[PDB]
């Protein structure tokens, strides 16, 4: 019985291009326009190790070539996984920052100060959003899950504070890609199917 006898192949979930994708839009339009450039490079940096690149062959992938004319009018094509992703997470991610632009108390900043703690913040951030999260969650009865609660918050704090600092983008993207990708993984793929939620 089972399936334990030297045949060990069937699935396996391997498609972080999608964790990634979704931090881009989310932090994309966190600050909308003017401060583009500046997430092209963070991708420039970016990548997914994967199972592998493009081994098959050497030369090229006759790709569109030529110009692009799109006239915006191929972004509402929701087609491509990768362009739906992408169009629910500037979506959600858009009607949260209309909700940002009034930031309570002083909170994005610290978000933006714990955050920042120069290089240490992807560890710094992690065990900042890690303890912060537990935190304010220490009071929120959770029993069933803390991924939704404890994303939702932890993750809108990092984006957060990209508002207040689009300085720390890099920083901000894994910010949710990365507490998450540690056990939380599963949950980001959510993030995209409910754009925030």
């Known amino acids: 019985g089972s399936m334990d006898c ?28 003017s401060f583009r450039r500046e997430l092209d490079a963070l991708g420039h940096e970016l990548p997914v190790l994967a199972p592998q ?11 569109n070539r030529s110009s692009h004319s799109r006239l915006g009018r191929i972004e509402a094509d929701s087609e491509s996984q990768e362009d739906i992703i992408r169009n629910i997470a500037r979506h959600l991610a858009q009607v949260g920052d209309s909700m940002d632009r009034s930031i309570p108390p002083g909170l994005v900043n610290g978000l933006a100060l714990q955050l920042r703690n ?11 959003l890690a303890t912060a999260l537990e935190q304010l969650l220490q009071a929120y009865p959770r029993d069933m ?30 910010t949710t890609v990365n507490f998450i990708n540690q056990n939380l993984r599963t949950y980001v793929r959510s993030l995209a199917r409910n754009g925030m939620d």
């Open 145 to 174: 899950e803390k991924e939704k609660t404890m994303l939702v918050l932890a993750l809108l704090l990092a984006k957060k504070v990209a508002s207040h600092t689009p300085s720390l983008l890099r920083d901000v993207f894994h």
């Open 53 to 63: 690149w493009e081994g098959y062959d050497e030369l090229q992938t006759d790709g």
């Open 6 to 33: 030297e045949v060990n192949n069937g699935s396996s979930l391997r498609d972080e291009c999608i964790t990634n994708l979704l931090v881009f839009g989310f932090l994309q339009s966190c600050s909308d326009n």
């Open 118 to 128: 120069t290089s240490r913040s992807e560890e710094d951030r992690n065990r900042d």
